[PDB]
A paper describes a structure:
One interesting member of the trypsin family of serine proteases is urokinase-type plasminogen activator (uPA), which catalyses the conversion of the zymogen plasminogen into the active protease plasmin through cleavage of plasminogen's Arg15–Val16 bond (using the chymotrypsin numbering). From a phage-displayed peptide library, we previously isolated a serum-stable, disulfide bond-constrained peptide, CPAYSRYLDC, termed mupain-1, which competitively inhibits murine uPA (muPA). While being unable to generate crystals of muPA, we did manage to crystallise huPA-H99Y, a murinised version of human uPA which, in contrast to human uPA wt, is able to bind mupain-1, although with a somewhat lower affinity than muPA. In the complexes, the inhibitory peptides adopt cyclic conformations with an overall Ω shape.
Considering the unexpected effect of the D9A substitution, we also crystallised mupain-1-16 D9A in complex with huPA-H99Y, but in spite of the much higher affinity of the D9A peptides, the structures of the mupain-1-16 and the mupain-1-16-D9A complex were indistinguishable. Noticeably, however, the relative B-factor for mupain-1-16 D9A was higher than that for mupain-1-16 (1.39 versus 1.24). Surprisingly, Ala-substitution of Asp9 of mupain-1, mupain-1-12, and mupain-1-16 led to a 3–10-fold increased affinity to huPA-H99Y. This observation is in contrast to the expectancies from the X-ray crystal structure analysis, which predicts a polar interaction between Asp9 of mupain-1 and Arg35 of huPA-H99Y. The ITC measurements showed that the increased affinity of the Ala9 peptides to huPA-H99Y, as compared to the original Asp9 peptides, was associated with a binding entropy penalty but mainly accounted for by a more favourable binding enthalpy (except with mupain-1 and mupain-1 D9A, in which case the differences were not statistically significant). The Ala9 peptides may be able to sample a larger conformational space and visit conformations with peptide-enzyme interactions which are inaccessible to the Asp9 peptides. Also, the relative B-factor in the huPA H99Y complexes was higher for mupain-1-16 D9A than for mupain-1-16, in agreement with the idea of the D9A peptides being more flexible in the complexs.
Residue numbers in the entry:
A (entry chain P): 1 to 10
B (entry chain U): 16 to 37, 37A, 37B, 37C, 37D, 38 to 60, 60A, 60B, ...
The structure:
C-alpha cells in the first residue's frame, strides 16, 4: 500500500 | 468523507457502490465509482489491483446505505474489469489510477435510469474549472481518520480545486502530483475525502453541466493542513475511456 493510499483495504 | 453532510442517492444518482465477495461468502465494501453510461462504471485501478478477477465483485446503483438495502436499488455482476495499463504505485501515490467496470445483471441487463439511478457527463478534453472552483465529493469513506468503522449512510462534501503550481510545492506534495492529477481541499482543511472514498466522483459544474472532473485517488492523511486530496484528472483520459467503452 502506498503511504498516501485511501483504499479501504490498506 | 471528513466533515460535510449526510445525503441520499437522489443527490448523487450516478454513485456506484462496489463490493467484493470473499472465500466464505461474506461481502465487503471496496470502493466508489460513477455511472458514465448504462453499462459502464468508472472507478480507480488501485481498488482492484490486489484482487483483479471480475467474478469477485458486485456493483450496486441507487444505493444510499452501506450494509442495508435501499428501495429501488439495482445489483450487478462485473462483465468486464478494465484496469489501466500504465498504472503504478510508489511509496506515496498512485499513477494512472483509473478503471472501467462493465456491469450486467443476473438477468443480463445494464442499468435502468430512475429517480435514484442516473449517469454523469464526462468533461470536454483537457477542459477543467479554474482553481478556486467549488466541487462535490461523495462516498461511504471514514468520517474520521481514527475511525475503525465506515458510516452506514452516504455522505458528501465540498472542496475547492487547487492550482497545479500550489499543489506541487514541496510544502504540499512536490513532484508527486502530475498534470494527470487534480488537487482539491477545504480552505480550513476541515473537510475532505478519506479511507474508503477511493474511486468515487469529484463533480464540478463546467458551463451548466454536472460533470465528472475527478476520481478520488490518494492523499496524505485526511483533512490535514497542506495535504490536499488528489484526484485522477478525468479530462486527461478521454481517449482511454472512449477506446475501452466503444
Ligand atoms: N483526500 C484524502 N485525504 N485522501 C484521498 C482518499 C484516500 C485517503 C486520502
Amino acid at each position: 500500500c502506498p503511504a498516501y493510499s485511501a483504499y479501504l483495504a490498506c | 468523507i471528513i466533515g460535510g453532510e449526510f445525503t441520499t442517492i437522489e443527490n448523487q444518482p450516478w454513485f456506484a457502490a462496489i463490493y467484493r465477495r470473499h472465500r466464505g461468502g461474506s461481502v465487503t465494501y471496496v470502493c466508489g465509482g460513477s455511472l458514465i453510461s448504462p453499462c459502464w462504471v468508472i472507478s480507480a485501478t488501485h481498488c482492484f489491483i490486489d484482487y483483479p478477477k471480475k467474478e469477485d465483485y458486485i456493483v450496486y446503483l441507487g444505493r444510499s446505505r452501506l450494509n442495508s438495502n435501499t428501495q429501488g436499488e439495482m445489483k450487478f455482476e462485473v462483465e468486464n474489469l478494465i484496469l489501466h495499463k500504465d498504472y503504478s504505485a510508489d511509496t506515496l501515490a498512485y499513477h494512472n489510477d483509473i478503471a472501467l467496470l462493465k456491469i450486467r445483471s443476473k438477468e443480463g441487463r445494464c442499468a435502468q435510469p430512475s429517480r435514484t439511478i442516473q449517469t454523469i457527463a464526462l468533461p470536454s478534453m483537457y477542459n477543467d474549472p479554474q482553481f478556486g472552483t467549488s466541487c462535490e465529493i461523495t462516498g461511504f469513506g471514514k468520517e474520521q481518520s481514527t475511525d475503525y468503522l465506515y458510516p452506514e449512510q452516504l455522505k458528501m462534501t465540498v472542496v475547492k480545486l487547487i492550482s497545479h503550481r500550489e499543489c506541487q510545492q514541496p510544502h504540499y506534495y512536490g513532484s508527486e502530483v502530475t498534470t494527470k492529477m487534480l488537487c482539491a481541499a477545504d480552505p480550513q482543511w476541515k473537510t475532505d475525502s478519506c479511507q474508503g472514498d477511493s474511486g468515487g466522483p469529484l463533480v464540478c459544474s463546467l458551463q451548466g453541466r454536472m460533470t465528472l472532473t475527478g476520481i478520488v485517488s490518494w492523499g496524505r492523511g485526511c483533512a490535514l493542513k497542506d495535504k490536499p486530496g488528489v484526484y485522477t484528472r478525468v479530462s486527461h483520459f478521454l481517449p482511454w475511456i472512449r477506446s475501452h467503452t466503444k
